Amino acid sequence: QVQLQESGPGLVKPSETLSLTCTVSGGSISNYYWSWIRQSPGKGLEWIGYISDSESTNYNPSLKSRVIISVDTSKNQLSLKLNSVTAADSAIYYCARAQQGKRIYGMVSFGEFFYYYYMDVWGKGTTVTVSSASTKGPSVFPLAPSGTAALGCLVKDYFPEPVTVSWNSGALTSGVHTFPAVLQSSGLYSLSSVVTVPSSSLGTQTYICNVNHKPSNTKVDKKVEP
Amino acid sequence: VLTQSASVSGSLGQSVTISCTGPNSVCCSHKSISWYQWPPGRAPTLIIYEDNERAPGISPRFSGYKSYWSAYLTISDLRPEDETTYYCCSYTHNSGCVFGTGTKV
Amino acid sequence: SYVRPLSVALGETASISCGRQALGSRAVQWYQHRPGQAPILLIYNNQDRPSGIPERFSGTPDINFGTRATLTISGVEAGDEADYYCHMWDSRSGFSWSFGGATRLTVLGQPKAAPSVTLFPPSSEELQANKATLVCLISDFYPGAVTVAWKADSSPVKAGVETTTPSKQSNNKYAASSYLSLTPMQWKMHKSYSCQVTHEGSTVEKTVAPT
Amino acid sequence: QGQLVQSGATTTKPGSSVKISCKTSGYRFNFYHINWIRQTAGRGPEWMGWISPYSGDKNLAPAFQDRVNMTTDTEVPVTSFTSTGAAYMEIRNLTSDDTGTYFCAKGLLRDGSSTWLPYLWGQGTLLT
Ligand SMILES: *[C@@H]1O[C@H](CO)[C@@H](O[C@@H]2O[C@H](CO)[C@@H](O[C@@H]3O[C@H](CO[C@H]4O[C@H](CO)[C@@H](O)[C@H](O[C@H]5O[C@H](CO)[C@@H](O)[C@H](O)[C@@H]5O)[C@@H]4O)[C@@H](O)[C@H](O[C@H]4O[C@H](CO)[C@@H](O)[C@H](O)[C@@H]4O)[C@@H]3O)[C@H](O)[C@H]2NC(C)=O)[C@H](O)[C@H]1NC(C)=O
Numbered sequence: 001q002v003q004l005q006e007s008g009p010g011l012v013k014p015s016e017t018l019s020l021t022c023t024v025s026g027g028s029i030s031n032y033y034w035s036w037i038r039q040s041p042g043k044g045l046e047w048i049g050y051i052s053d054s055e056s057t058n059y060n061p062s063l064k065s066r067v068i069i070s071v072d073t074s075k076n077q078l079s080l081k082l083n084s085v086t087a088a089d090s091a092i093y094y095c096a097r098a099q100q101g102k103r104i105y106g107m108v109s110f111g112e113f114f115y116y117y118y119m120d121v122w123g124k125g126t127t128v129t130v131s132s133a134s135t136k137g138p139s140v141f142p143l144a145p146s147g148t149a150a151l152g153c154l155v156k157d158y159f160p161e162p163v164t165v166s167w168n169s170g171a172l173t174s175g176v177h178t179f180p181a182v183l184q185s186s187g188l189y190s191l192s193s194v195v196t197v198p199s200s201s202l203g204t205q206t207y208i209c210n211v212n213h214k215p216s217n218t219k220v221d222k223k224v225e226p
Numbered sequence: 227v228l229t230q231s232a233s234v235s236g237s238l239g240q241s242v243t244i245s246c247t248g249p250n251s252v253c254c255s256h257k258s259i260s261w262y263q264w265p266p267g268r269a270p271t272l273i274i275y276e277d278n279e280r281a282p283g284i285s286p287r288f289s290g291y292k293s294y295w296s297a298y299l300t301i302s303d304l305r306p307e308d309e310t311t312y313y314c315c316s317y318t319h320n321s322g323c324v325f326g327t328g329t330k331v
Numbered sequence: 332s333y334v335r336p337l338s339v340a341l342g343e344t345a346s347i348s349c350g351r352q353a354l355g356s357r358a359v360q361w362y363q364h365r366p367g368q369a370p371i372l373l374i375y376n377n378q379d380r381p382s383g384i385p386e387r388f389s390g391t392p393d394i395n396f397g398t399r400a401t402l403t404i405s406g407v408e409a410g411d412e413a414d415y416y417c418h419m420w421d422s423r424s425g426f427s428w429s430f431g432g433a434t435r436l437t438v439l440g441q442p443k444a445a446p447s448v449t450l451f452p453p454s455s456e457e458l459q460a461n462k463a464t465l466v467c468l469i470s471d472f473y474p475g476a477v478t479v480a481w482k483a484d485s486s487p488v489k490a491g492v493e494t495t496t497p498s499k500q501s502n503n504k505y506a507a508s509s510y511l512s513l514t515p516m517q518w519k520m521h522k523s524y525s526c527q528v529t530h531e532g533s534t535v536e537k538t539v540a541p542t
Numbered sequence: 543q544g545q546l547v548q549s550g551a552t553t554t555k556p557g558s559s560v561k562i563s564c565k566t567s568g569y570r571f572n573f574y575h576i577n578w579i580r581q582t583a584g585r586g587p588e589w590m591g592w593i594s595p596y597s598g599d600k601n602l603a604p605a606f607q608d609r610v611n612m613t614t615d616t617e618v619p620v621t622s623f624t625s626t627g628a629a630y631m632e633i634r635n636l637t638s639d640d641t642g643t644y645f646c647a648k649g650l651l652r653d654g655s656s657t658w659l660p661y662l663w664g665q666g667t668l669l670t
């Protein structure tokens with residue numbers, strides 16, 4: 001019923017205002033609590049802050065001095081603004097709905113209770129990289145094949161992570177296998193997607209490899225054939 | 227459009243690293259970078275061309291390096307005469323040499 | 332934050348004790364997180380679990396004070412490998428901003444699986460660009476650790492190789508990629524190129540040649 | 543070796559059109575391009591254009607596209623590998639915002655990728 005979807009730049013220069021947004025699908029926004037969570041490599045999950053149903057804010061003191069969370073009720077969008085970003089600010093920024101719980105141990109009249117918040121539905125994450133380097137679209141090269149056979153699609157020299165790859169614009173989905181990237185010494189990632197198809201399908205089921213690298217708005221297509 | 231380092235300094239014996247970068251119009255992986263030592267209002271000097279090839283006689287402490295997004299000029303083992311203004315330049319084989327902003331060292 | 336490991340045999344019952352013990356009445360949340368993926372709230376109140384989570388995930392309620400918060404995962408499977416966070420709230424301490432430590436759960440006694448190596452020669456368009464890359468794609472292997480070895484003809488080649496650290500797949504197996512970069516002349520002037528993938532005790536070779 | 547003596551540093555006023563000379567020695571004048579470079583004070587140094595003392599082919603920046611005339615006269619054989627040459631420079635719709643020091647520099651190599659690159663410079667001339 002309720003799903004969330006993040007969206008961000010992916011690349012932000014050092015000492016610059018990072019800005020992400022998050023869309024709610026199915027439910028409203030001004031009747032729930034929403035939290036921003038990031039997860040850096042090596043470091044654990046870090047709670048950034050949250051916003052109420054009355055649009056009241058409360059930031060983590062770890063980054064209180066430079067985080068501003070907002071909300072737009074015209075639709076179901078809530079944003080995040082983080083300035084003065086450093087190299088340690090690159091992470092997968094998640095977006096989740098917080099649910100207020102009231103743990104009561106003594107007398108509510110004396111205030112012998114405390115509120116706790118928990119995230120019950122999360123987003124999918126937005127990869128964000130803080131680097132002085134500039135974005136670069138990839139270079140797609142086909143890998144033609146020769147029981148069954150396997151063909152590929154080589155996505156080399158792009159920055160930064162990630163890159164989505166679908167086969168036949170989304171039609172081909174069985175046997176697809178996209179492999180994690182590789183950070184070469186030059187500083188650019190290199191991917192590789194491969195599907196296993198029946199050998200007899202070589203003539204002539206068209207195999208269109210789709211590649212999208214949003215940090216450079218450079219989508220490309222390429223066909224494979226022996 | 228070809229931005230250089232604002233300014234920087236060092237000391238005798240240490241090293242310097244000048245920067246030079248720009249957009250897809252003048253940089254980089256499909257262009258060559260030359261580094262000119264240019265005292266203000268005097269005869270310039272070609273230090274390094276083709277990203278890292280030194281001119282005949284240039285001291286080996288001068289070294290060039292080009293990333294896929296920014297070219298560099300290292301000036302190791304400083305000396306008194308290094309107090310000049312340096313300018314980078316982007317060119318191809320059959321075109322012009324778009325100079326850089328400048329870097330006071 | 333720091334990571335504390337835990338090994339549980341396949342099919343056993345995992346007992347993940349919380350990182351910090353409560354000073355008063357508590358309300359503890361349990362999150363499941365596998366890196367590169369969104370967390371999964373397993374239990375929100377001291378024992379209340381949301382929908383879409385099996386009954387084998389259980390937490391300890393706050394009946395009497397002194398009971399430690401432990402997440403119990405009965406009947407562990409290879410999918411239960413993830414980081415487990417214990418978001419601890421209590422009447423005494425302040426506002427729980429930190430999710431706490433991270434219990435890295437690995438499930439022992441999983442079936443050994445041999446890799447599926449697939450080597451591709453340099454594409455024509457890449458060679459037209461005066462560059463050439465050999466790619467060695469390894470997948471469906473467990474335990475997730477392999478060693479690649481690139482050889483020009485029979486002599487070894489280590490200058491120009493880039494290999495991925497293994498990555499868990501959706502079927503709980505691992506995948507790795509190896510990229511050998513070389514000039515297009517070194518691809519023509521040699522007879523054949525091979526990618527040796529050694530996994531566990533055995534080694535598997537896939538070779539390619541410009542023909 | 544190689545020398546490139548430039549003209550005098552006299553000054554004029556806007557609307558005019560001045561000629562700048564560059565006399566070469568110690569090298570074959572035909573074998574290398576001749577570049578014209580401008581070091582204004584209210585701007586970064588600008589490459590104006592180069593010309594071929596051998597093929598007559600010229601190439602100038604689009605900022606000087608229809609405003610500059612680059613000409614060279616044929617060399618004079620001194621020895622088997624030495625000749626004397628001269629290069630000329632003119633400006634059309636000239637103002638006073640084009641004020642600065644002007645240099646002439648010959649090409650780097652006779653072939654390759656950095657053929658025309660300004661390598662050996664002159665002493666410069668002050669303008670208006
Ligand atoms: C005698 O001596 C003279 C003087 O040294 C020699 O002339 C020089 O020859 C070399 C090599 O042939 C030249 O170097 C090349 O320079 C070009 C740059 O010119 C290009 O750009 C012009 C302006 O943009 C353009 O107009 C030209 O295009 C045509 O138009 C002219 C009009 O006259 C025509 O003459 C041309 O022939 C063209 O048809 C021109 O294309 C540059 O592009 C070259 O780089 C390429 O090639 C090198 C390898 O050679 C390669 O490394 C590069 O990556 C790139 O692929 C190359 O640098 C030089 O410009 C000539 N002139 C000089 C030095 O003043 C002559 O060759 C000698 N002849 C003999 C018989 O000894």
Ligand SMILES: *[C@@H]1O[C@H](CO)[C@@H](O)[C@H](O)[C@H]1NC(C)=O
Nearest residue numbers: 608609610611612613630632
């Ligand atoms: C440059 O000056 C010479 C001098 O006679 C002239 O013949 C030539 O046409 C001029 N060039 C241009 C482009 O007008």
Ligand SMILES: *[C@@H]1O[C@H](CO)[C@@H](O)[C@H](O)[C@H]1NC(C)=O
Nearest residue numbers: 282543544569649650651661
């Ligand atoms: C080319 O050779 C001549 C021969 O004396 C030399 O003077 C000149 O410096 C050389 N050019 C370069 C760029 O070194």
